[PDB]
Amino acid sequence: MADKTIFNDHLNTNPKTNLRLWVAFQMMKGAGWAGGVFFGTLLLIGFFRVVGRMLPIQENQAPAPNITGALETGIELIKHLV
Template sequence: MSDRNEPWYLENDQKPSLKMWVFTQMAAGAGWGALVFFGVVLFIFALIAISSILPEDPFAALESGAALASALV
């Protein structure tokens, strides 16, 4: 490596280590876990947002629609 006179930050003379492999596997697992966790949280918040838009009594909308239809006919 010293024949090419590369800067110290471009030299790659490190051997693969078990510690680094374990760290990358655990970091990837933590990333996937965080993705799933926040996905579930966002899904629950989306359901809460949709439920706040919907009426409390769903059959009331049907009755008012039927009354409107009978008034028009």
């Protein structure tokens, strides 16, 4: 709640500046830089990693022949019924 300059106040609550600027470094500095660098990578890896952990499985193009889309058919073998 207290920022620099006026932070002199006996009241601590200094995160107002430290956090606010850190939050500013990612939104303002992390938006133009990390935005394209970071997101460009996360989309490259997060999208590349998902294209292999949820495609070679579903992309197979099959209703319920080889499997059942996710994991398997409605089976309560785990004993998690109701």
